[PDB]
Ligand binder design. Structure first.
Ligand SMILES: CCCCCCCCCCCCCCCCCC(=O)O
Ligand SMILES: [Ca+2]
Length: 450
């Protein structure tokens, strides 16, 4: 009611998915869910044309390093041909539109802006580009990004920094700077404690709760989007939603919702009910099955990542998807917007455990701290029917925020997945063992277990 809209800007290879839990937290504290907005943009182009400096002569050395490897030298020519100033103006005008719509919709005169990682560079340039744009910002929140520069003039800014070893000397001048040395890069963005500090910083009081509070009623409104990983463009395809049982078995002959999707979609589902989101993206025979915990309240920020050029990470698994053994094994992708760490460290204070059919794939070698694993690929490397966990899957060592585990997952019956979080608590799933020749399985773990 007496709240301002907040607009979040993600980092490189990120999306609104990183603010999904904070959105639910804002709503559980009285914000109308619609007052929390996200701005999505193409991070590969932004980084290559605008943040070149951060990319190679600074912060994001990791993506910079494997830019030449992950992208077609010709394709990179096209992106690098693009004009910097044109790109900036066109992207800033689009953000101006999101902000203005948020202002009209709430009657508020200003909004709060929040950036994470590259998003902080983005927002600082944005607020500094014109007096007209800054006048509409009540508070600026910079999460684990830019340091060593001035906070925009006259804009209350708060910079929050996490543990540096995830590749207190980080200060934004004139901003309130605080630190959470117990947190990793993405975790800092989705964490309930970052939520309490952001909330307090913009509202002047500690929120009553930091939990994702189950709302009353049988239904939840879900607004989501199937988009390209990293470039974030709309993806078209067909979506079938099926309520499922404790073992992943479809409870209905026909899907409870079937629809053509061109990016965003909105649907009404049951609160606390497990669901399988099956998707077929235009021009691909593969059937995707996305699984995640039940929705306990409205979620207007759900994201289903799809692999597409020029950064088709999924092709790295094609050799195995094409082998005859592929009819015999499953291939899955585990995602958590909170680094899965298999390397013990005191400051971070804990190791996660991730079991697939009883085997722990979050090892020191597979999931070292420096890897900041948010996406773990589990499949039979080489299609040789052997689970060589101690042999690194080299092809993924080049992808940012990812890793892989050579594990044989028989395509018969079900697959059980169990995670024990480094911050405590456990979550598990049991889903069908779809074969890798025609199916792809994606399982997203919640980024916080209370
Ligand atoms: C099916 C293919 C989809 C690809 C799956 C990859 C999933 C991995 C999750 C990525 C986590 C987002 C990282 C956000 C950090 C941003 C860094 C920056 O801002 O510079
Ligand atoms: Ca193997």
């Amino acid at each position: 009611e007496d709240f301002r809209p907040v607009v979040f800007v993600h980092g490189l290879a990120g999306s609104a998915g990183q603010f999904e839990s904070q959105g639910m937290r804002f709503a559980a504290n009285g914000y109308p869910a619609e007052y929390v907005k996200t701005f999505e943009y193409d991070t590969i182009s932004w980084a290559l044309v605008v943040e070149t400096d951060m990319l190679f002569s600074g912060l994001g050395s990791e993506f910079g390093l494997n830019i030449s490897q992950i992208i077609d030298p010709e394709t990179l020519d096209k992106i690098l041909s693009k004009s910097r100033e044109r790109l900036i103006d066109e992207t800033f005008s689009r953000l101006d539109r999101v902000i203005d719509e948020a202002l009209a919709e709430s009657g508020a005169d200003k909004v709060d802006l929040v950036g994470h990682s590259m998003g902080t560079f983005f927002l600082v340039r944005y607020v500094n580009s014109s007096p007209e744009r800054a006048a509409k910002v009540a508070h600026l929140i910079l999460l684990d990004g830019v340091w060593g520069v001035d906070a925009p003039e006259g804009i209350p800014t708060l910079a929050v920094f996490g543990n540096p070893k995830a590749l207190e000397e980080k200060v934004v001048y004139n901003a309130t700077n605080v630190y959470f040395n117990n947190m990793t890069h993405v975790q800092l963005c989705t964490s309930p404690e970052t939520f309490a500090v952001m909330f307090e910083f913009i509202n002047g009081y500690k929120p009553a709760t930091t939990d994702i509070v189950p709302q009353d009623g049988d239904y939840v409104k879900v607004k989501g989007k199937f988009l390209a990983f990293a470039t974030n463009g709309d993806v078209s395809g067909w979506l079938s939603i099926y309520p499922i049982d404790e073992n992943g078995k479809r409870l209905t002959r026909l899907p409870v919702k079937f629809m053509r999707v061109k990016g965003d979609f909105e649907v009404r589902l049951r609160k606390g009910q497990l669901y399988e989101f099956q998707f077929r993206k235009d021009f691909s025979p593969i059937i995707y099955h996305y699984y995640r915990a039940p929705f306990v309240r409205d979620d207007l920020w759900a994201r289903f990542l799809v692999s597409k050029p020029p950064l088709d990470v999924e092709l790295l698994i094609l050799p195995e998807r094409l082998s005859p053994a592929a009819k015999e094994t499953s291939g899955l992708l585990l995602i958590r917007y909170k680094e899965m760490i298999g390397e013990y460290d005191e400051e971070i204070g804990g190791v996660d455990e991730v079991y697939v059919n009883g085997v722990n794939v979050c090892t020191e070698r597979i999931c070292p701290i420096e890897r900041a694993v948010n996406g773990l690929w589990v499949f039979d490397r080489g299609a040789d029917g052997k689970s060589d966990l101690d042999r690194e899957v080299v092809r993924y060592s080049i992808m940012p925020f990812m890793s892989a585990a050579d594990l044989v997952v028989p395509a018969e019956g079900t697959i059980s997945i169990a995670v024990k979080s480094r911050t405590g608590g456990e979550e598990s799933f049991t889903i069908p063992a779809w074969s890798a020749d025609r199916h792809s399985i994606i399982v997203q773990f919640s980024d916080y277990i209370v």
